[PDB]
Amino acid sequence: GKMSSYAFFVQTCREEHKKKHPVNFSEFSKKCSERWKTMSAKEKGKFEDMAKADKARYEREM
Amino acid sequence: KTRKESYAIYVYKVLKQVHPDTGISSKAMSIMNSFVNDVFERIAGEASRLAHYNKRSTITSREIQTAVRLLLPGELAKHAVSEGTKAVTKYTSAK
Amino acid sequence: KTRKESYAIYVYKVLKQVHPDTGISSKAMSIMNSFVNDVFERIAGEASRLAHYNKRSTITSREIQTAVRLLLPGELAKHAVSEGTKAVTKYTSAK
Amino acid sequence: TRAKAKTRSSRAGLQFPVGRVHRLLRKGNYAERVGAGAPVYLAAVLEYLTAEILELAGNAARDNKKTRIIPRHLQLAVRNDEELNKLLGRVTIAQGGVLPNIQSVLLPK
Amino acid sequence: TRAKAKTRSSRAGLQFPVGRVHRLLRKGNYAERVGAGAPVYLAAVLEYLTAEILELAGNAARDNKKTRIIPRHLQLAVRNDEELNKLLGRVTIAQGGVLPNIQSVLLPK
Amino acid sequence: KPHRYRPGTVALREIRRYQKSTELLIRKLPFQRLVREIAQDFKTDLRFQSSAVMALQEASEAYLVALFEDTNLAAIHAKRVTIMPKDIQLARRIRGER
Amino acid sequence: KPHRYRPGTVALREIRRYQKSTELLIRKLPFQRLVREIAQDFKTDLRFQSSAVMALQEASEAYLVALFEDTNLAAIHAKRVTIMPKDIQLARRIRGER
Amino acid sequence: RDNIQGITKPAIRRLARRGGVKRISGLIYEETRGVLKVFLENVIRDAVTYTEHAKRKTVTAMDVVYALKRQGRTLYGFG
Amino acid sequence: RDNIQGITKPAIRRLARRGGVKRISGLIYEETRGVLKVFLENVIRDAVTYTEHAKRKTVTAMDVVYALKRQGRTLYGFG
DNA sequence: CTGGAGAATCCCGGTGCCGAGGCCGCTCAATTGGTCGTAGACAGCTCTAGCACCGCTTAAACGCACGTACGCGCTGTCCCCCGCGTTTTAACCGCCAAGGGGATTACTCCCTAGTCTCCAGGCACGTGTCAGATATATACATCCTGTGCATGTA
DNA sequence: TACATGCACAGGATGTATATATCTGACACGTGCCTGGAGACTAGGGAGTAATCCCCTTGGCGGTTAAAACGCGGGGGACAGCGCGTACGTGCGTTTAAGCGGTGCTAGAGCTGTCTACGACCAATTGAGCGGCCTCGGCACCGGGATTCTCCAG
């Protein structure tokens, strides 16, 4: 299928805490979603382009 | 004294289709008349509850069909639904 | 969004007469609401059959009183009939 | 003039009384209104269920070497059929008696 | 309405709603017509049986060192009283649990 | 010496005669007096239609006969063939009457 | 030697805990998949409300727990403390559920 | 006087034989009589309740079948 | 990994412990899974029958409590 | 019968939270006060069927004598199931997105109820008769101890 | 060494089943009629529909930890023989009361005709009860201690 703009934000937010500056969903979803609650429209446009590449993939993958 | 209705003549008409040679005692007839009235009140009572649960106010062949699928055991239900569907389909051609 | 009715405020008003210092949780309240709905249907459904057997078209206090005597165990039936008789007597004389 | 009447059961092809069943649905207080397809479906189901129990009771009458059905034959018909014994699973038939059965460990061997 | 209104429950001396009980008796198809004494009798019975189960549940709550009734206390109330257990003999209460009970022949001596 | 059937031989012969017949097994007048005596506690000077005491007898015999089948199963589940008061008390507790 | 509780000591301790407390005892996802699998035979692509599977679990655990009490009585009647399949089969037949 | 004794030992044995019972302990007769008396009390109380509601002085066979149906023991053959 | 095997041996032991059972034979587990599957089939069939009658594609908690109430096992707590 | 160590269950102080319950605004269902049509209370009649009492005949109940068949205690011997270390695996804790589908709303028309008339289907009743219920004899099928064949020691 | 005793009949005795000659009351049918259903009509509103709305069910992210699964010893309960006393099945005199068939009676079911108290239904008009909303307090995990049941070598 396809993946959301939030899914690519969660993936990039997770890599930041995981190996960019050193996973389980349980406690991380607070920090991740409260960051999404104030995420900037220019970052949202980048994650929307990622969601567009995922949707272009989904049109082939079904 | 005054007239009391019962299913007895219709039970006897059906009996003479299924076993033309047999008869039925009056004690067996009052059991059959009890059975017809019991199954009537069970089906109609569940059709009433189905109509009320769905906020409708008309009892219709859908209500009777679903009441027959809940009340009857597995093989009797498929046969009873088939006889009812046949009868309404025939009736609709001449009503 | 659209209004859904329940007995919950009356259950709470009765609780605050018998144990004024206690309260009731939302899961206990939906059990109490279910109990009141079930006992209402059990009394009214027998009152409906009592009226029909006697060819009457009206449910009255006699039909409700008899349905209570049929449905309730012996010690509850004496009290429930006494509370019902007191309520009809107060209502009729205060009207 | 007015066309010669014919009973609603005849239009349906039934022998059970569609007009009575309609009056019983109306006068029984089951709902505010009764659709014309409901009495036909219900009359057909009462006639079907009647045909099933009478067939098995007429077989029981022939097996008991008698020409007329009696309460015994209705009890034997119902309790041998594995679905009529569910439909009538908490009904007692007056003068029906009991279906012959003995527990195997009671036998004299 | 020229005079001032007073709820039928207030004339009857009840907490339960006489008017609602009358609308439910009318719209439930229980009979063709409903007499004015039937709702006040039925509302008084529902209020009484509600007071019984809540009284015993508030005792069970206090004895369990709590101030809020929860499903457990309704089960403990219903299963200890001889008549309420008979009235509710084929009803289950979600989150109620079981009444503590061990057969004496299982005990360790 | 005279003939003897062996103990339990006539018991099986009786089971077979009473499962063959439909007749009522309680004596009618004794049962009718029991029905009137029980009803006397609920209303005084009460009359009974003759059809009503027959309906109560048909119901009562059908109830007891079915309880004896359940009692027989409760006895036969233990390694026994004699029914005992414990078997009635089990049957009526599993059947939800007590 | 290390400490041991005797056989059946911890069984009575378990009986007490599970009668003291109101929790559901079947694991939720495992039960929810069984409900969906059984439903698939009656209609395909059927959805469930999150409270509908809870109502099915509450009713199911209340049924099996009430069956085990009658099963336990059928074992005590036969002079045994161990429950066995013949006890479930008796308990069902005496309540008319088989 | 006592009327439950009219449910004789031979009568209870015939009911037990129709139920398929081979051997009967001597304590069954009093246990049965108690169980029958409790059954009749439960049916005849409801039947008298229908009779009083009808404002009648005779019990009628319909009151018995209504009392039996109301307890989940439906009796066919008496209308 | 049949989905009925998700009713684990530990879970059946907990249900039997709430039922007051001290000792359990190893054949109880398959007998109890057979009984549970029969119970669920009878309730779910009727709940789907109410669902089809409503022309809906989801089962709702009301369909379950109506199915249980029709089978004489009234559940309180879900309205 | 028990002193003393082990391990589980408990009683209490501290700690955080999210659900009970109290408040406010607004639509909708319960009052109030008409008119009017009829369901049922009531009184009086008819006559069914329930109650009471008796005599006679006869099956069924009962009370006892008799003696195995069954229930129950006790012993002994396994074979399971329980308690618990050790390893393995999948349930469940949060957050959200996508969209499938219950919920609501405005339109509108076909179907059910009311309301006539006016016969023919279904009841109460009367009436012969034949299948079920008796009868007396006869016919297999089942039950329950001694009787010899054919087993085996002496 | 002088008869043991299984055991498959042989059969005497006892019941259940079948063929059958007559009798009778309950059945299947015939009929007069009368009332409940059908034929033909109109009106309004429930139900089916198409169009948004928005909401909640379905799917998805891993880690870790808690629940399930596994392996094992050994104990204590399931279960099969055995001995033995008594309780309950069988069968006979004897007795008692149920079932029958008359008689006679009247309470009370079941009904019709009437008069009115009572409930339906409509048009106003409020105030009770619901949804949305906030907030702070009862309950639910913690963390020690500690205590209280458990098992076994004394």
Side-chain angles (χ1 to χ4, degrees), chain A residues 1 3-13 15 19 22 26-29 32-33 36 39-41 45 47 51 53 56, chain B residues 1-94, chain C residues 1-94, chain D residues 2-3 5-108, chain E residues 3-109, chain F residues 2-97, chain G residues 2-96, chain H, chain I:
Chain A
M3 295 74 65
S4 67
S5 58
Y6 181 62
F8 297 115
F9 164 83
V10 173
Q11 189 275 350
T12 53
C13 183
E15 289 292 293
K19 88 184 198 299
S26 322
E27 77 277 25
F28 173 50
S29 298
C32 199
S33 65
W36 192 239
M39 174 281 317
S40 66
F47 299 128
Chain B
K1 190 186 178 74
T2 194
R3 287 167 55 265
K4 302 307 299 181
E5 58 171 36
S6 72
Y7 287 88
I9 70 164
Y10 316 109
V11 174
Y12 191 83
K13 280 176 176 183
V14 175
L15 184 58
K16 293 305 199 178
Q17 290 189 316
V18 69
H19 287 294
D21 55 323
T22 197
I24 183 160
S25 59
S26 58
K27 293 297 300 184
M29 187 60 80
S30 72
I31 292 156
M32 287 300 301
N33 184 62
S34 305
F35 170 67
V36 174
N37 279 283
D38 184 47
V39 175
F40 174 91
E41 293 171 17
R42 288 155 76 178
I43 292 165
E46 190 61 27
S48 170
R49 283 178 287 280
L50 286 165
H52 188 281
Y53 295 168
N54 288 91
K55 315 301 175 184
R56 294 299 198 264
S57 75
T58 320
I59 282 169
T60 71
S61 61
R62 282 186 60 77
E63 316 305 313
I64 302 299
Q65 175 153 309
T66 299
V68 170
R69 293 168 60 200
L70 293 159
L71 269 293
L72 278 62
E75 208 66 24
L76 290 179
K78 289 180 292 180
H79 291 178
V81 164
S82 303
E83 301 307 316
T85 301
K86 178 176 59 180
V88 175
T89 303
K90 194 178 192 294
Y91 178 87
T92 298
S93 78
Chain C
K1 195 176 182 70
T2 304
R3 297 172 74 264
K4 313 302 293 183
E5 67 180 13
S6 74
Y7 292 91
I9 58 158
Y10 318 113
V11 171
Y12 184 73
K13 283 173 185 293
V14 173
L15 178 60
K16 289 287 180 169
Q17 288 179 354
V18 71
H19 289 292
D21 50 347
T22 67
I24 184 163
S25 60
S26 50
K27 290 302 304 184
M29 187 61 83
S30 70
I31 293 156
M32 287 302 303
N33 185 61
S34 303
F35 169 66
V36 173
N37 276 267
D38 188 42
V39 176
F40 170 91
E41 286 183 5
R42 285 159 68 167
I43 296 164
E46 188 61 24
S48 178
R49 288 178 285 280
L50 282 164
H52 179 276
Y53 299 163
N54 293 91
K55 321 306 182 298
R56 295 291 191 280
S57 77
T58 317
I59 288 165
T60 77
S61 58
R62 284 184 59 78
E63 288 70 26
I64 302 298
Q65 173 151 310
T66 306
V68 175
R69 287 173 58 196
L70 291 167
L71 269 290
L72 277 60
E75 191 75 350
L76 291 178
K78 288 182 297 183
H79 298 164
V81 168
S82 301
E83 297 305 311
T85 301
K86 184 178 63 184
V88 169
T89 302
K90 196 179 194 298
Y91 171 74
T92 305
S93 59
Chain D
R2 169 209 301 252
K6 60 186 176 182
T7 317
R8 279 188 282 175
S9 55
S10 307
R11 292 181 171 113
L14 298 179
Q15 300 204 322
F16 266 54
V18 173
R20 183 173 298 182
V21 167
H22 191 52
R23 76 99 85 78
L24 293 165
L25 287 173
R26 280 183 175 168
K27 293 190 184 292
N29 298 310
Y30 295 108
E32 182 181 43
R33 40 164 62 191
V34 178
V40 175
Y41 204 114
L42 181 55
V45 169
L46 298 175
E47 183 175 1
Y48 164 69
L49 290 171
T50 298
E52 288 287 357
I53 188 173
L54 290 179
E55 186 176 302
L56 296 174
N59 282 340
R62 194 182 68 248
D63 290 350
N64 198 28
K65 200 163 59 179
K66 280 180 164 60
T67 79
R68 300 198 296 243
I69 294 173
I70 67 166
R72 182 51 162 182
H73 304 167
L74 295 169
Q75 178 80 311
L76 296 176
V78 169
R79 310 306 160 187
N80 282 288
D81 184 288
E82 199 251 321
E83 294 202 343
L84 292 176
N85 194 46
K86 296 185 210 298
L87 185 69
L88 302 176
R90 65 181 69 264
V91 172
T92 57
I93 294 177
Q95 300 291 298
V98 162
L99 183 68
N101 179 260
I102 302 185
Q103 292 298 332
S104 60
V105 304
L106 301 181
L107 298 178
Chain E
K4 297 185 179 183
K6 52 197 185 182
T7 314
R8 279 185 273 175
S9 299
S10 309
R11 291 183 166 86
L14 303 179
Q15 304 307 305
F16 271 55
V18 167
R20 178 172 299 180
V21 169
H22 189 56
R23 198 205 60 254
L24 291 169
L25 283 174
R26 279 183 168 168
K27 295 189 187 295
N29 307 297
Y30 299 109
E32 181 184 328
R33 42 170 65 198
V34 178
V40 296
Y41 203 117
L42 179 56
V45 171
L46 294 171
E47 182 168 321
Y48 169 62
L49 295 173
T50 296
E52 284 288 348
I53 188 173
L54 290 173
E55 182 178 339
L56 296 171
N59 287 327
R62 179 199 63 230
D63 297 350
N64 194 30
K65 205 184 176 184
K66 276 176 158 60
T67 67
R68 300 210 215 281
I69 294 171
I70 63 162
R72 183 48 163 181
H73 306 157
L74 295 169
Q75 179 81 306
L76 292 175
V78 168
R79 305 306 166 189
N80 280 292
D81 183 74
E82 213 276 340
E83 287 81 11
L84 288 177
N85 186 48
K86 194 179 181 73
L87 178 67
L88 303 178
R90 58 167 67 264
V91 177
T92 60
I93 289 170
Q95 302 285 297
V98 164
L99 184 72
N101 177 37
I102 305 184
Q103 292 297 332
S104 61
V105 296
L106 302 179
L107 299 175
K109 182 53 59 178
Chain F
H3 181 275
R4 299 291 297 196
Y5 293 107
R6 194 167 46 80
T9 292
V10 185
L12 291 171
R13 199 167 71 218
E14 285 185 330
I15 289 165
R16 290 153 186 168
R17 87 195 306 279
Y18 297 119
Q19 288 185 344
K20 192 174 67 164
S21 75
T22 55
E23 298 186 331
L24 293 171
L25 302 178
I26 307 170
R27 202 58 57 214
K28 298 190 182 75
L29 278 159
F31 183 86
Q32 184 179 44
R33 295 194 306 280
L34 177 64
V35 169
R36 292 180 190 272
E37 176 156 306
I38 290 172
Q40 180 66 4
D41 296 352
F42 303 122
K43 191 179 184 296
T44 52
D45 302 342
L46 185 77
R47 290 163 74 109
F48 279 85
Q49 288 203 286
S50 187
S51 184
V53 302
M54 297 306 296
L56 286 171
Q57 189 166 350
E58 292 265 9
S60 303
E61 294 197 18
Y63 170 78
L64 287 181
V65 167
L67 176 63
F68 283 123
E69 298 185 54
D70 294 337
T71 306
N72 197 29
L73 288 163
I76 292 283
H77 172 67
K79 297 173 184 180
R80 272 188 294 101
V81 302
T82 311
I83 61 161
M84 300 179 73
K86 59 172 66 175
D87 303 309
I88 295 177
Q89 292 165 12
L90 183 70
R92 289 177 67 264
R93 184 149 163 77
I94 306 293
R95 212 157 72 165
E97 299 182 32
Chain G
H3 181 280
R4 289 296 299 269
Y5 290 111
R6 215 135 44 78
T9 288
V10 187
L12 290 171
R13 199 166 70 213
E14 286 179 353
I15 288 161
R16 288 152 193 168
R17 85 196 307 279
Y18 297 116
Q19 289 184 350
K20 189 170 65 165
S21 61
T22 56
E23 303 182 318
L24 292 173
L25 301 177
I26 304 170
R27 200 59 57 209
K28 292 190 176 70
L29 259 62
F31 187 80
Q32 185 172 30
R33 288 194 294 272
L34 176 58
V35 170
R36 292 180 191 275
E37 177 172 285
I38 289 172
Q40 192 77 331
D41 295 345
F42 305 124
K43 190 183 183 298
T44 52
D45 302 348
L46 185 78
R47 291 163 74 100
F48 279 81
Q49 288 192 333
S50 55
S51 53
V53 302
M54 291 296 292
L56 288 164
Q57 192 169 345
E58 292 272 357
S60 300
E61 294 192 18
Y63 174 76
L64 294 183
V65 169
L67 175 65
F68 281 125
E69 292 190 88
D70 286 351
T71 302
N72 192 35
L73 290 176
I76 297 313
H77 185 70
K79 307 297 189 71
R80 299 177 278 96
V81 298
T82 309
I83 63 163
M84 302 181 76
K86 62 179 68 175
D87 306 319
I88 296 171
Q89 293 170 6
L90 182 72
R92 288 183 70 188
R93 207 199 177 282
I94 298 292
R95 72 168 55 182
Chain H
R1 73 175 213 78
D2 190 17
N3 274 306
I4 189 63
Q5 310 306 328
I7 310 301
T8 69
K9 166 168 175 274
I12 296 160
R13 291 166 71 80
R14 285 190 294 273
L15 292 162
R17 293 283 183 272
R18 184 173 281 163
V21 179
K22 186 180 179 180
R23 186 177 152 106
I24 300 163
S25 60
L27 303 180
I28 287 287
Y29 309 115
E30 290 301 292
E31 195 70 5
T32 290
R33 284 152 189 164
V35 169
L36 176 61
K37 190 172 186 285
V38 170
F39 175 86
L40 282 178
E41 282 170 18
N42 285 346
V43 182
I44 298 159
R45 185 166 51 260
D46 290 2
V48 174
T49 300
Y50 289 106
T51 301
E52 287 191 315
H53 186 74
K55 298 137 76 170
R56 264 190 286 96
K57 296 185 179 72
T58 196
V59 181
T60 276
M62 297 304 298
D63 308 320
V64 179
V65 314
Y66 296 154
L68 290 167
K69 182 158 63 177
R70 183 263 139 195
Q71 295 181 17
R73 301 189 184 284
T74 305
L75 175 65
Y76 287 179
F78 293 91
Chain I
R1 345 161 186 177
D2 193 4
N3 284 297
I4 187 60
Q5 306 299 332
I7 310 301
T8 72
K9 164 167 174 278
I12 297 167
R13 292 171 70 77
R14 288 192 291 268
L15 292 160
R17 293 294 185 236
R18 183 167 289 178
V21 177
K22 188 178 178 182
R23 186 175 161 105
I24 302 165
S25 61
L27 300 183
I28 290 290
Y29 308 117
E30 296 296 80
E31 196 71 3
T32 295
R33 283 149 185 164
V35 168
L36 176 61
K37 192 170 188 284
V38 169
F39 176 80
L40 283 176
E41 283 170 6
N42 287 328
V43 179
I44 293 171
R45 188 167 59 263
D46 285 358
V48 173
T49 301
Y50 288 107
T51 302
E52 286 192 325
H53 189 65
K55 302 180 67 179
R56 291 187 274 93
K57 309 183 172 57
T58 193
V59 182
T60 281
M62 290 297 193
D63 308 320
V64 180
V65 299
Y66 297 159
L68 292 167
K69 181 172 178 178
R70 185 256 152 188
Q71 296 173 8
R73 302 184 191 282
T74 301
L75 175 62
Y76 284 1
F78 296 94

